[PDB]
Amino acid sequence: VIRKFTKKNVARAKKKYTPFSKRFKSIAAIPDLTSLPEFYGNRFENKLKTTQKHQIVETIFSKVKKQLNSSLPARENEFASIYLSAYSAIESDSATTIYVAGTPGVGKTLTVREVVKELLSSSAQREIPDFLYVEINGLKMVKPTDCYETLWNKVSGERLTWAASMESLEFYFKRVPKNKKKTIVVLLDELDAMVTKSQDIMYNFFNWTTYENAKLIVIAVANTMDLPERQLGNKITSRIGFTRIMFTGYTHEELKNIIDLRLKGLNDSFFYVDTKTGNAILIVRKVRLRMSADAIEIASRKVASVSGDARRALKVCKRAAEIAEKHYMAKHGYGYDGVQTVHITHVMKALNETLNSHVITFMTRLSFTAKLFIYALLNLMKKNGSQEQELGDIVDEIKLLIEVNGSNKFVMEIAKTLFQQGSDNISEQLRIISWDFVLNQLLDAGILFKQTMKNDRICCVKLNISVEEAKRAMNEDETLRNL
Amino acid sequence: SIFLRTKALLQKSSELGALPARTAEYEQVMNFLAKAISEHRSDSLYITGPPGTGKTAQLDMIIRQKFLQNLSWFELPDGRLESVAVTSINCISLGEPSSIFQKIFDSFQDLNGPTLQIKNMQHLQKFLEPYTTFVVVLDEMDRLLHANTSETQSVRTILELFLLAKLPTVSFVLIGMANSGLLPQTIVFQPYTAEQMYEIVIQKMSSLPTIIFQPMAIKFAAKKCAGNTGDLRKLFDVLRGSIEIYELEKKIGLNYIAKVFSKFVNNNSTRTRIAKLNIQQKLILCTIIQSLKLNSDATIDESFDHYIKAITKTDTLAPLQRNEFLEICTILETCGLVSIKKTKCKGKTKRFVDKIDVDLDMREFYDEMTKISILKPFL
Ligand SMILES: Nc1ncnc2c1ncn2[C@@H]1O[C@H](COP(=O)(O)OP(=O)(O)OP(=O)(O)O)[C@@H](O)[C@H]1O
Ligand SMILES: Nc1ncnc2c1ncn2[C@@H]1O[C@H](COP(=O)(O)OP(=O)(O)OP(=O)(O)O)[C@@H](O)[C@H]1O
Ligand SMILES: [Mg+2]
Ligand SMILES: [Mg+2]
């Protein structure tokens, strides 16, 4: 047959369509699912392995940088609340929802994972019954319904399509008796990412916690405390509940304790450093490593002022150690193959490059034509105050600025280059040389905005950057500030 | 432990002929069945209400107490015997709203027999014709509407079900519960009051040997949780949080309810947010809100531009740069005074850009920076 179009790259999974409600004849026909070899969890790692032919030189700051990587001193009350709710709901065989919200990097996922680890340790001591832990991250899903595919695959071991998985989970949570079940603890991380238009997924996940036979713990980690009030309906907000756990950004003393806990064994300690290569061994010269308490304190105070984000504090300390290690390796010439201190200067330089703006020094290093464009644009904003200027007006005002300051030395040397490219055989041009080039360059830089128009004269252009930093970059130039 | 079982009873997933504080509505719903199974007349019932009012709980209570798969017996007011088939279906947990007829058929037919393929009104209408009463309870009937389409096609499935529960030569009685001459009967479930919530709580904890709450604490929790448009789920979480707060420190007193209602309300308090700021950060906050006053859709760059010109008009507190301006804006967003969002312009150049907005009351702002009483003209 002759097709009207073709779909030649269809990749379909081997997922069955029949839900769990048709797996046995009756409710009484359902066996004990705990004594089943595929329920409740009853190969790629070696492809990224090779043989090492050299000996990596780990310098003395490499252990500091390794210990400062992201891979519970400040979360006691949050840990205790989450653990007590989960322990009470597991040991009494009930279903509940715990809500956790906070800004990035305040220890939400780490605290919930530690709670789950301690509950698994308590279930290994036969103090609470066994449970299955499932982690669903909404930003790791391709489609939002794939969470239905994930959770059911973690429960039964089957692979169904998402609608059949949703019916299977509904039948499982509602109809299967508690004597044939295991408790499930589900972490719904990045809860805002699973919010869709119809909000059926959110309703189903929080409504399964209201069923009497469910034995389901849903720990929902969010980014805002008012997500059910802003984005969800009244039905899902009623099911989530009034009790919500806020993870506040860290104060500077807790960030100080976090950084000291990552460096408890390294700070104020001695290393055997081999001066031939640079390789350092933690307990040939005996060198003491030190990072200043003033440096850690000022980085922690800065980070707690900004966000209270532990990732940022660890990254600022790691960047300071990297800067100091770069200077040390440069001054000794070591390569990769008596007191070494990472100081408050390195911490301030790590804190400054994140706060430095390149926009002004980008604009001060442009050519004369791009600066002339920006200067004429600012002149037109001063003349009429419209904040959007047509490109033809910019052309006319560039021409005006050339013919008005014609007695200037630099302008009377630049005019032949601008309008004829220094050639007698080239006619006088309506645009300057490199007009399109500097227009497109300022558009790709994000300095400029241009409307989608086909007439080149009446097309409007807007500053995307702030006006005063453009004026500062214009007054930096010698020629433009004199005319 | 008494604390564990009391915490178990006050979950949203705990069950308990009539529920407490609902018996009259129970009788109303029962009166529906007291006709429908009596005269073999197909009829349709609509139930509304705000969330947590006991619709699903009372219907499941009725199904578990007083009632080819899922066949059982029901007694009328005279009460001889009657063969009934009772199921319950949540409409949101289905794939498509058009398959619900098939779902009803997969809720009724014996698994050993021939499983037919069902599309619409007609095949279900032909299937129930040789028969025995069929009780269907459909939770969330409103999500049976199609959120797309229009008014003509969103009310296809619901009108089809209402017509199929109204015509003769079948025995189809339909109960539908949504949230708040053949039109359905309506009982509005009402939000609970403080006395109703109190009686529900003592009825639920009557299975417990002791009561580890003072009754004044339950009454205070009920009167704060009821208000207007109350939900019993909120009262359950308040009492459960009181137990958790009590055992995280060590009968439950009056104070622990207030400790719950101080722990889980944000307590915005713009004055104490402002008092944690610096004088420079207060100056940037004043310039930001003045820029929002006079521009009404201002990006961060125009706000910084206004800040530069406004504090060069004063010639005190020498100015800072744009990136550290954004840094103090981030401090203000961390404090809870400023929201930065990513939106589109309304100009000829429509592109994305970062916009700045406030969520603070003007009276506390103006009072707290007139109490500063040195740097005036930014207010
Ligand atoms: N209390 C802490 N003690 C030690 N390290 C911590 C602590 N809190 C956070 N960290 C570090 O910061 C990292 C970020 O924490 P986490 O993943 O829990 O953040 P989050 O709140 O879930 O953030 P996001 O919303 O971005 O996912 C942790 O992996 C850990 O390296
Ligand atoms: N009168 C009552 N006695 C005992 N428990 C009750 C009573 N009313 C409600 N509950 C409990 O309240 C919770 C929610 O009740 P239910 O599911 O019936 O609410 P609903 O009105 O259907 O709400 P929604 O619109 O949110 O679905 C359940 O735990 C239920 O046991
Ligand atoms: Mg996280
Ligand atoms: Mg309900």
Side-chain angles (χ1 to χ4, degrees):
Chain A
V1 86
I2 299 304
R3 281 75 145 297
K4 299 176 190 197
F5 63 99
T6 49
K7 297 161 96 174
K8 296 204 156 279
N9 306 283
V10 176
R12 193 177 176 91
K14 253 60 189 213
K15 295 170 174 173
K16 303 321 184 261
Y17 310 150
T18 308
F20 191 68
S21 65
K22 309 165 173 353
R23 201 76 73 265
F24 314 105
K25 297 180 178 179
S26 71
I27 275 174
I30 299 165
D32 169 52
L33 315 175
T34 77
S35 74
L36 222 64
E38 277 274 302
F39 268 62
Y40 307 113
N42 310 330
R43 74 265 195 189
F44 292 120
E45 45 279 309
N46 298 336
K47 290 185 261 334
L48 294 181
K49 304 300 286 177
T50 179
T51 42
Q52 163 93 33
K53 292 180 179 179
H54 276 107
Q55 178 182 359
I56 305 170
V57 169
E58 293 178 350
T59 89
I60 200 180
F61 305 98
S62 321
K63 274 88 177 177
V64 184
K65 292 190 306 180
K66 253 174 281 274
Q67 264 321 90
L68 279 167
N69 279 332
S70 293
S71 294
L72 214 64
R75 300 289 182 205
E76 297 56 46
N77 301 313
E78 297 88 1
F79 186 92
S81 304
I82 295 162
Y83 180 79
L84 183 72
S85 282
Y87 195 94
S88 303
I90 285 159
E91 185 257 288
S92 163
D93 289 306
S94 63
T96 196
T97 281
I98 309 162
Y99 193 91
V100 162
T103 47
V106 298
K108 296 183 303 282
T109 302
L110 188 66
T111 304
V112 176
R113 275 179 188 157
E114 232 53 51
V115 159
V116 168
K117 211 174 316 322
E118 281 304 272
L119 289 159
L120 283 167
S121 145
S122 162
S123 154
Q125 290 144 17
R126 290 182 181 174
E127 225 39 50
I128 48 143
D130 257 36
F131 62 96
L132 168 82
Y133 171 56
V134 185
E135 193 163 309
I136 298 172
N137 188 294
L139 282 175
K140 299 187 183 306
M141 296 287 118
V142 166
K143 288 126 73 73
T145 56
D146 284 337
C147 71
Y148 287 141
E149 295 185 356
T150 294
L151 176 59
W152 180 243
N153 183 241
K154 290 315 194 205
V155 170
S156 75
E158 307 165 8
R159 291 185 74 221
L160 307 186
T161 55
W162 75 262
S165 279
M166 184 203 36
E167 293 177 350
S168 301
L169 285 158
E170 158 78 27
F171 176 81
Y172 168 78
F173 285 135
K174 203 196 197 32
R175 312 286 187 198
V176 176
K178 300 164 70 157
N179 65 282
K180 297 157 174 196
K181 270 178 164 177
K182 200 200 256 211
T183 313
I184 304 162
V185 175
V186 179
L187 168 62
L188 289 184
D189 217 340
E190 329 292 325
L191 179 83
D192 55 286
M194 328 161 181
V195 164
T196 73
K197 293 300 297 312
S198 45
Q199 333 198 279
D200 297 298
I201 299 173
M202 291 291 270
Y203 176 80
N204 276 325
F205 263 91
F206 290 121
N207 182 46
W208 291 329
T209 47
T210 64
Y211 288 168
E212 193 264 352
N213 288 331
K215 297 214 299 164
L216 174 61
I217 323 290
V218 167
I219 299 170
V221 169
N223 60 2
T224 55
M225 281 282 273
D226 64 357
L227 211 177
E229 278 82 18
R230 292 300 212 282
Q231 292 150 254
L232 305 178
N234 316 296
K235 231 159 57 244
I236 309 164
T237 314
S238 182
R239 280 154 173 88
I240 284 155
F242 181 77
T243 287
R244 291 177 191 151
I245 303 172
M246 207 285 144
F247 270 60
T248 310
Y250 295 111
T251 71
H252 75 269
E253 50 264 5
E254 325 161 301
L255 295 168
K256 221 286 192 303
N257 306 140
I258 283 165
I259 289 140
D260 299 334
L261 221 33
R262 308 299 197 88
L263 302 169
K264 177 173 279 292
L266 289 169
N267 222 332
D268 295 18
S269 298
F270 291 92
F271 289 75
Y272 273 26
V273 181
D274 205 313
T275 76
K276 293 180 179 179
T277 66
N279 200 0
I281 302 301
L282 167 66
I283 302 306
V284 164
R285 292 183 183 174
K286 194 194 190 74
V287 189
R288 199 179 217 170
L289 198 139
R290 180 182 293 176
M291 221 177 48
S292 170
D294 293 334
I296 289 151
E297 175 113 2
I298 218 61
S300 296
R301 280 171 184 273
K302 197 65 167 101
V303 165
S305 266
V306 177
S307 38
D309 183 334
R311 266 183 214 118
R312 193 104 290 290
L314 292 157
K315 267 155 193 189
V316 156
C317 290
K318 194 216 298 146
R319 183 67 179 127
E322 166 77 88
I323 290 166
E325 178 232 10
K326 190 227 317 183
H327 270 32
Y328 166 85
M329 253 166 92
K331 103 169 281 287
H332 283 303
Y334 276 154
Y336 298 94
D337 207 287
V339 171
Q340 287 302 325
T341 313
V342 162
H343 204 266
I344 206 150
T345 40
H346 311 133
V347 164
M348 284 321 285
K349 288 175 298 153
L351 281 179
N352 271 127
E353 71 189 29
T354 325
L355 215 47
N356 265 308
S357 192
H358 187 73
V359 165
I360 294 180
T361 176
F362 182 80
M363 287 181 297
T364 58
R365 287 166 192 176
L366 299 180
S367 66
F368 172 69
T369 49
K371 292 193 190 181
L372 187 56
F373 185 90
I374 295 170
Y375 177 91
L377 191 271
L378 292 175
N379 248 34
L380 288 175
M381 310 175 57
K382 274 206 100 43
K383 202 172 59 192
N384 51 82
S386 178
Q387 300 276 318
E388 316 68 71
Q389 310 291 327
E390 309 198 326
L391 277 158
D393 295 332
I394 305 181
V395 170
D396 301 332
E397 218 269 313
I398 283 162
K399 189 88 230 193
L400 193 141
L401 278 148
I402 291 306
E403 56 203 332
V404 160
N405 314 282
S407 74
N408 200 345
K409 297 178 181 179
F410 179 75
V411 183
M412 84 205 261
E413 301 337 304
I414 199 95
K416 179 99 184 288
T417 297
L418 287 179
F419 292 111
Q420 283 177 277
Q421 216 165 1
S423 170
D424 282 311
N425 315 147
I426 285 175
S427 306
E428 173 95 344
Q429 304 276 298
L430 294 183
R431 305 297 178 265
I432 59 173
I433 302 294
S434 78
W435 160 263
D436 88 350
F437 192 86
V438 301
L439 175 55
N440 281 326
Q441 166 197 123
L442 295 172
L443 287 169
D444 308 356
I447 292 166
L448 232 54
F449 274 171
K450 180 190 187 285
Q451 76 169 123
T452 313
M453 216 58 198
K454 95 170 299 202
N455 187 264
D456 304 335
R457 287 197 61 83
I458 62 67
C459 199
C460 260
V461 137
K462 196 201 190 264
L463 268 184
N464 182 42
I465 51 138
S466 90
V467 187
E468 316 293 338
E469 97 200 320
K471 274 128 163 222
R472 263 185 65 201
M474 290 297 90
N475 304 356
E476 206 268 23
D477 192 18
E478 293 177 350
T479 278
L480 295 177
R481 84 178 188 253
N482 300 349
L483 56 100
Chain B
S1 173
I2 176 49
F3 291 117
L4 168 90
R5 325 185 28 198
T6 320
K7 193 149 31 151
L9 289 189
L10 304 160
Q11 302 272 12
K12 304 181 190 89
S13 71
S14 62
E15 322 289 82
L16 202 55
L19 277 182
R22 275 299 178 255
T23 166
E25 288 88 15
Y26 159 79
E27 276 124 31
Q28 279 171 54
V29 154
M30 270 336 265
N31 192 32
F32 203 85
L33 305 175
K35 309 215 172 343
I37 320 187
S38 305
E39 329 175 351
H40 294 242
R41 193 217 317 141
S42 98
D43 207 24
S44 86
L45 173 48
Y46 197 52
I47 286 158
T48 89
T53 37
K55 325 184 274 295
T56 310
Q58 183 66 85
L59 261 304
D60 286 352
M61 189 71 287
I62 284 165
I63 291 158
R64 186 215 308 151
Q65 291 291 99
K66 289 199 325 267
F67 304 87
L68 205 73
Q69 68 216 339
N70 296 66
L71 258 72
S72 189
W73 308 102
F74 174 73
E75 297 177 355
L76 310 174
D78 54 350
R80 55 280 207 161
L81 73 166
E82 261 93 9
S83 190
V84 202
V86 182
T87 72
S88 181
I89 284 149
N90 193 287
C91 301
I92 300 182
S93 209
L94 325 190
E96 292 293 326
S98 71
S99 60
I100 188 188
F101 306 123
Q102 174 101 47
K103 163 66 119 152
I104 290 161
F105 198 130
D106 322 317
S107 79
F108 280 144
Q109 194 243 333
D110 198 9
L111 262 294
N112 312 35
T115 59
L116 277 314
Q117 180 152 357
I118 309 299
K119 307 89 183 74
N120 42 12
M121 179 136 197
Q122 277 65 38
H123 294 96
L124 185 53
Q125 179 192 340
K126 289 178 179 179
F127 176 66
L128 319 163
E129 262 160 29
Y131 304 96
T132 303
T133 326
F134 296 108
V135 169
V136 282
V137 186
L138 281 193
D139 233 346
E140 329 292 325
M141 272 227 314
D142 36 290
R143 295 287 183 271
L144 270 199
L145 287 130
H146 305 99
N148 321 129
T149 71
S150 43
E151 293 177 350
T152 71
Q153 256 63 42
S154 299
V155 205
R156 180 181 63 192
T157 295
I158 293 167
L159 252 169
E160 179 160 339
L161 270 174
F162 280 159
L163 258 290
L164 174 286
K166 268 295 178 161
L167 87 172
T169 189
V170 273
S171 157
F172 196 71
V173 51
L174 167 63
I175 295 137
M177 338 178 258
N179 182 281
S180 279
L182 309 180
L183 86 168
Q185 191 182 320
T186 63
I187 308 75
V188 153
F189 269 53
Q190 292 286 340
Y192 291 107
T193 57
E195 209 256 23
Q196 289 184 295
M197 270 163 153
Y198 187 69
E199 161 218 33
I200 286 169
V201 166
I202 322 282
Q203 249 303 294
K204 283 189 59 47
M205 317 177 39
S206 151
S207 55
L208 292 170
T210 89
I211 304 306
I212 54 100
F213 300 59
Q214 300 305 132
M216 227 52 58
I218 309 177
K219 289 172 169 185
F220 174 56
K223 77 177 291 295
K224 196 172 277 188
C225 285
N228 291 315
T229 75
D231 43 351
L232 192 67
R233 295 183 177 123
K234 189 198 199 303
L235 178 67
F236 286 168
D237 322 318
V238 160
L239 298 168
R240 193 172 70 250
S242 296
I243 306 153
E244 290 169 307
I245 276 185
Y246 174 80
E247 59 188 272
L248 271 173
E249 265 146 329
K250 302 292 179 290
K251 312 317 91 203
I252 286 191
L254 199 277
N255 52 321
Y256 286 92
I257 320 287
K259 300 226 301 195
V260 167
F261 275 109
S262 74
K263 187 173 179 223
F264 305 115
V265 201
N266 41 7
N267 210 326
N268 299 324
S269 185
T270 313
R271 287 196 291 263
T272 63
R273 307 212 231 212
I274 279 159
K276 292 158 180 181
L277 306 173
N278 207 73
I279 176 62
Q280 187 168 59
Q281 295 150 5
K282 281 170 219 173
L283 161 70
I284 296 120
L285 163 67
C286 281
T287 66
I288 284 163
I289 187 60
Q290 182 162 45
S291 82
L292 314 204
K293 190 174 181 179
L294 60 106
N295 196 29
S296 158
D297 46 279
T299 69
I300 324 187
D301 291 2
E302 322 173 313
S303 281
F304 170 68
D305 274 350
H306 170 339
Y307 150 79
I308 286 299
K309 63 177 180 180
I311 76 159
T312 49
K313 284 178 180 178
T314 316
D315 209 66
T316 80
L317 203 54
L320 56 70
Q321 300 193 89
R322 192 251 165 194
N323 262 7
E324 29 170 333
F325 177 83
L326 192 45
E327 203 260 301
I328 287 115
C329 288
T330 313
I331 297 163
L332 283 156
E333 183 178 2
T334 311
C335 290
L337 303 157
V338 167
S339 82
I340 311 165
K341 302 222 262 283
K342 172 71 150 168
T343 38
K344 288 174 65 313
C345 274
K346 217 53 74 72
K348 285 174 178 169
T349 318
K350 295 176 316 310
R351 333 289 294 282
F352 273 97
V353 62
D354 282 33
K355 263 184 19 153
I356 182 141
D357 276 317
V358 294
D359 52 320
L360 55 100
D361 306 358
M362 305 144 261
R363 276 89 55 196
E364 280 76 16
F365 151 77
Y366 270 115
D367 197 68
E368 211 60 38
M369 256 90 54
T370 43
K371 282 170 77 173
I372 295 310
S373 292
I374 33 170
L375 304 177
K376 284 186 175 182
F378 313 100
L379 284 85

